[model samples]
Every structure is written in structure tokens, then in C-alpha cells.
Target: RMKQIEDKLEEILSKLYHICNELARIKKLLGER
Candidate 1:
């Protein structure tokens, strides 16, 4: 059970990482303009 919760946490964190990367990319583009 504990392992399952940890797995879920990692999954959520990876999603957050992707979201942050997207936000950063957008910010970079805005800065260019």
C-alpha cells in the first residue's frame, strides 16, 4: 500500500515537472518579444 502511494506521488511529480517545463518555455518566448 505504501509503495502504491509513493508511485502515485512520483507520477504526479513528473506531471508537475512537465508543466513547469512548459511554463518556462512560454516565459522564454514572451521574453524574446
Candidate 2:
């Protein structure tokens, strides 16, 4: 709950969100094939 923490939180959140999306796509491809 300090200053400038929001920037880091958002950056990490977006990074993780992208990773999750990539994993989901891979799972779908494996399941379809």
C-alpha cells in the first residue's frame, strides 16, 4: 500500500494474464488434435 506499487502490480498481472492465455491456446490445440 505504498507509492508506485500499482505500476508493478499491473505489469506483473498483464504478464501472467498473457501466459495464461498462451497456455489455454495450447491446451485447446492439443485437445483438438
Candidate 3:
């Protein structure tokens, strides 16, 4: 169903967002060091 596909896409996007945030945190920490 379309609703199921949308839910899956939302989940994927959420995971990608978390990954991006983690990368940003690492970059900031390295720059400070």
C-alpha cells in the first residue's frame, strides 16, 4: 500500500538525519581539537 511505502520512507529519512547529525558533531569536535 501507498501508506506503507510512505512510512518506510519516513523511517529511512529519520535514520539519514541521525547519521548526518552524528557526522556534524564529529566534524565540530575535530575542528575544536
Candidate 4:
């Protein structure tokens, strides 16, 4: 179903967002250190 696909897409994007945030944090910390 389209709704199920949308939900899965949202979940994948949320995970990607978290991963990007984590990478950003690591880069910032590395620069600070």
C-alpha cells in the first residue's frame, strides 16, 4: 500500500537524519579538539 511505503520512507529518513546529525557532531568535536 502507499501508506505503508510512506511510513517506511519516513522511518528510513529519520534514521538517516540521526546518522547525519551524529556525523556532524563528530566533525564539530574533532575540530574543537
Candidate 5:
């Protein structure tokens, strides 16, 4: 179904967000990009 396809797409989004958020956290602590 379409929902399964959407869930797979969402998994990719989740991974990207996780890495971006982690880098954001590092910048917060070190104040460097």
C-alpha cells in the first residue's frame, strides 16, 4: 500500500534529521559550525 511506501520514505527522513540534529547539538556546545 501507499502507507508502506510512505513509511520507507519517512525512515530516510528520520536518519537525516538525526545526523543534522546531532551536528546542531555539537555546534551548541562548541559554538562552531
Candidate 6:
């Protein structure tokens, strides 16, 4: 049970990180203009 929870947490964090990364990239591109 603990392992499952940890894995889920990791997955959630990974997705959040990806989303943040994309947003950062988009902002950078817009800023360049």
C-alpha cells in the first residue's frame, strides 16, 4: 500500500513538472518577441 502511494505521488509530480516546463518554455518564447 505504501509503495502504491509513493508511485502515484511520483507520477503526479512528474506530470506537474512537465506542465510547468511547457509553460516556462511558452513564456520564454513570448518574452523573446
lDDT of 5: 0.94
Model 6 agreement with the true structure over 1-33: per-residue lDDT tens digits: 999999999999999999999999999999999
Question: 1-33, model 5: which lDDT tens digit per residue?
Answer: 999999999999999999999998998989753
Q: Give one digit per residue, the lDDT tens place, for model 1 in 1-33.
A: 999999999999999999999999999999999
Query: In model 4, what are the clashing residue pairs, if there are any?
Result: none
Candidate whose TM-score is highest: 1
Model 4, 1-33: lDDT tens digits are 999999999999999999999999999999998
Judged by whole-model lDDT over C-alpha atoms, candidate 1 comes out at 1.00
How does candidate 4 fare on TM-score? 0.78
Model 2 lDDT per residue over 1-33, tens place = 555798889999999999999999999999999
Measured on C-alpha atoms, candidate 6 has an lDDT of 1.00
For 1-33, candidate 3 gives per-residue lDDT tens digits of 999999999999999999999999999999999
Kindly provide the TM-score of model 1 when superposed on the true structure, using C-alpha atoms. Answer: 0.85
Score candidate 2 by lDDT. Answer: 0.94
Cα TM-score per model: 0.85, 0.75, 0.81, 0.78, 0.56, 0.75
**Residue 8 in model 3: lDDT:** 100
The parts of candidate 2 lying over 4 Å away from their true place are none
Candidate 5 weakest lDDT stretch, 10 residues: 24-33
